[PDB]
Amino acid sequence: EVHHQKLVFFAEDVGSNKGAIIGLMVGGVVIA
Amino acid sequence: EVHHQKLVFFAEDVGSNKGAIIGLMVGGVVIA
Amino acid sequence: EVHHQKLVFFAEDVGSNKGAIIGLMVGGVVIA
Amino acid sequence: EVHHQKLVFFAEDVGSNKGAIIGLMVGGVVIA
Amino acid sequence: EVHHQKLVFFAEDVGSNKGAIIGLMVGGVVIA
Amino acid sequence: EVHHQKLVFFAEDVGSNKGAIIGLMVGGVVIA
Amino acid sequence: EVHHQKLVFFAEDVGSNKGAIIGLMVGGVVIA
Amino acid sequence: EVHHQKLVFFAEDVGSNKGAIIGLMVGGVVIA
Amino acid sequence: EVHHQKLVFFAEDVGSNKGAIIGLMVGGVVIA
Amino acid sequence: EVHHQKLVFFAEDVGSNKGAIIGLMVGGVVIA
Amino acid sequence: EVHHQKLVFFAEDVGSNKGAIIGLMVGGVVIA
Amino acid sequence: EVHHQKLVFFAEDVGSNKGAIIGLMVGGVVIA
Amino acid sequence: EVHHQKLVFFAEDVGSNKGAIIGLMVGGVVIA
Amino acid sequence: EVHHQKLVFFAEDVGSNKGAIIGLMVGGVVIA
Amino acid sequence: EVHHQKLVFFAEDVGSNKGAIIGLMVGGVVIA
Amino acid sequence: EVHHQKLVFFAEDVGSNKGAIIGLMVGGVVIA
Amino acid sequence: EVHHQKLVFFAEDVGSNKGAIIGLMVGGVVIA
Amino acid sequence: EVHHQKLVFFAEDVGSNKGAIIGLMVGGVVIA
Numbered sequence: 060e061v062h063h064q065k066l067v068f069f070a071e072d073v074g075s076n077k078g079a080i081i082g083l084m085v086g087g088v089v090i091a
Numbered sequence: 092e093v094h095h096q097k098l099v100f101f102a103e104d105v106g107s108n109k110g111a112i113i114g115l116m117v118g119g120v121v122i123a
Numbered sequence: 124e125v126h127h128q129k130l131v132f133f134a135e136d137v138g139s140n141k142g143a144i145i146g147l148m149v150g151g152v153v154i155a
Numbered sequence: 156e157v158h159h160q161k162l163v164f165f166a167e168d169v170g171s172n173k174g175a176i177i178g179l180m181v182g183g184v185v186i187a
Numbered sequence: 188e189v190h191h192q193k194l195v196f197f198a199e200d201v202g203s204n205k206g207a208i209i210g211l212m213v214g215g216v217v218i219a
Numbered sequence: 220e221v222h223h224q225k226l227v228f229f230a231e232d233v234g235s236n237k238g239a240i241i242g243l244m245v246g247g248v249v250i251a
Numbered sequence: 252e253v254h255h256q257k258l259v260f261f262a263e264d265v266g267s268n269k270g271a272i273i274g275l276m277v278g279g280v281v282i283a
Numbered sequence: 284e285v286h287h288q289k290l291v292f293f294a295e296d297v298g299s300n301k302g303a304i305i306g307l308m309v310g311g312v313v314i315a
Numbered sequence: 316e317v318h319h320q321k322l323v324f325f326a327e328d329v330g331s332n333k334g335a336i337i338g339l340m341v342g343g344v345v346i347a
Numbered sequence: 348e349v350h351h352q353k354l355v356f357f358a359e360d361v362g363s364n365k366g367a368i369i370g371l372m373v374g375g376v377v378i379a
Numbered sequence: 380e381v382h383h384q385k386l387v388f389f390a391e392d393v394g395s396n397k398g399a400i401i402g403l404m405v406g407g408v409v410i411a
Numbered sequence: 412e413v414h415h416q417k418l419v420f421f422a423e424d425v426g427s428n429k430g431a432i433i434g435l436m437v438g439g440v441v442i443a
Numbered sequence: 444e445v446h447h448q449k450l451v452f453f454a455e456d457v458g459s460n461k462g463a464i465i466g467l468m469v470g471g472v473v474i475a
Numbered sequence: 476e477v478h479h480q481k482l483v484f485f486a487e488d489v490g491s492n493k494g495a496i497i498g499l500m501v502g503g504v505v506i507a
Numbered sequence: 508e509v510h511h512q513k514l515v516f517f518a519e520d521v522g523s524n525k526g527a528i529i530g531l532m533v534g535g536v537v538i539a
Numbered sequence: 540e541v542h543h544q545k546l547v548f549f550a551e552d553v554g555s556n557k558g559a560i561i562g563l564m565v566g567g568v569v570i571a
Numbered sequence: 572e573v574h575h576q577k578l579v580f581f582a583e584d585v586g587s588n589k590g591a592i593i594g595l596m597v598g599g600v601v602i603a
Numbered sequence: 604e605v606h607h608q609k610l611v612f613f614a615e616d617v618g619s620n621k622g623a624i625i626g627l628m629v630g631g632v633v634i635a
Contacts, residue, residue: 193226195226195230197229200233204233204236218237
């Protein structure tokens with residue numbers, strides 16, 4: 060029982076979130 | 092089941108989420 | 124041969140979800 | 156076995172959130 | 188409880204967050 | 220101790236956070 | 252005769268935080 | 284002058300924090 | 316002068332902080 | 348609008364190619 | 380190269396293409 | 412402002428290549 | 444043309460290349 | 476021609492290269 | 508705004524190279 | 540103001556190189 | 572009033588280079 | 604302090620190098 064690459068983003072309870080972008084390789088992003 | 096690679100994004104209870112884009116390779120991402 | 128890769132997005136008791144997408148290879152994305 | 160990559164972002168309870176972007180490599184990001 | 192590369196960001200109880208960008212190799216970033 | 224790399228940023232009870240960026244190789248950051 | 256790379260920034264109770272940038276190699280940085 | 288590296292900045296209860304930058308190599312920094 | 320690379324800065328309770336930059340190589344730094 | 352995302356692994360005039368695998372999200376890869 | 384996503388695995392005049400696999404998502408891969 | 416993302420593992424006029432693996436988010440690779 | 448983020452691993456006229464592993468986030472790589 | 480984020484591991488006229496690994500957030504790497 | 512993130516591990520006219528490891532945030536690396 | 544970030548490891552006219560590791564933040568590096 | 576931050580490990584005309592490592596912060600380095 | 608930032612480990616015309624380690628905050632460095 061062992062993990063290697065643990066990629067968790069916002070993996071939990073949340074109330075209000077605006078503008079969520081997840082990407083190892085990205086570009087040109089505008090969060091209004 | 093989670094083994095070695097775990098790619099999760101906002102995997103849980105949420106109240107109000109606006110704009111959720113997940114991608115390893117992407118471009119030009121705008122959120123209102 | 125066993126696979127140890129896992130990929131997923133938001134998935135649970137959500138209240139107000141507006142604007143969601145998942146893509147390993149995709150460009151040009153706009154959310155309202 | 157000396158490979159252990161832990162990537163946890165916003166992995167917890169939160170109230171309000173505005174502007175969330177994650178990516179090992181990116182280019183050009185604006186937060187409102 | 189041993190980990191080689193540990194990457195923890197905003198991983199805890201938070202009230203209100205505004206402008207959060209995580210990226211080992213980022214460029215041209217602005218937070219309002 | 221151990222020959223490992225641990226990175227932590229904002230991992231505790233937080234109230235109001237404005238302007239947060241993490242990048243070992245960042246260039247041009249405007250935290251308003 | 253030991254060794255370890257520890258990097259902890261802001262890991263406790265915080266109230267009003269304005270301007271947070273972490274990175275070994277950072278160029279052109281400005282906070283308000 | 285050789286041993287483990289313990290990099291710790293601001294690891295306690297704090298009220299207000301204005302202009303916080305952490306990084307060995309930093310060029311051109313305007314902390315307003 | 317010490318031997319171990321213990322870089323500890325502000326590791327206790329603090330009220331209000333105005334301009335805080337931690338790093339070995341620093342150039343063109345202005346605090347308000 | 349659509350951004351510009353290129354993903355090239357190899358080019359013409361290869362010659363002797365022995366072992367070439369490409370995968371944005373893949374696990375377990377052994378090449379002779 | 381263009382205003383879109385272009386994933387190039389191989390090109391002409393390859394000569395000897397031994398061991399070629401392309402998959403956006405897949406686990407367990409063995410090639411001679 | 413203009414932003415683009417270009418990823419290239421190799422180029423033309425290679426000659427002889429043995430053992431090539433590319434993956435944005437993978438785990439467990441061995442080359443002979 | 445102009446480009447912001449460009450991940451170049453190798454170039455033309457490489458000649459002989461043995462053992463090439465390219466990946467943003469991984470864990471567990473071995474080359475003969 | 477504004478190469479903001481340019482990550483080059485190798486250039487042209489390589490000749491002979493044995494054992495090459497590139498990764499922003501990787502771990503557990505071994506080369507013969 | 509002014510900035511530029513340029514990183515190069517090797518240049519033209521290489522010739523002979525063995526054991527190459529490039530990574531901003533990595534750990535546990537052994538080269539023969 | 541004008542600020543930039545450059546990071547060069549090796550230059551042209553190399554010839555022969557054995558054992559090269561580059562990383563702003565690495566833990567546990569052993570070369571033969 | 573600062574120009575910029577630039578770091579160079581080795582220049583051109585290196586010839587025969589054996590055992591080389593670079594990193595703003597490293598823990599546990601050994602060269603044969 | 605308010606001045607150009609140019610860190611150079613070694614210059615051109617190296618010739619024969621063996622065990623070259625560079626880094627602001629190093630730890631457990633041993634050269635054979």
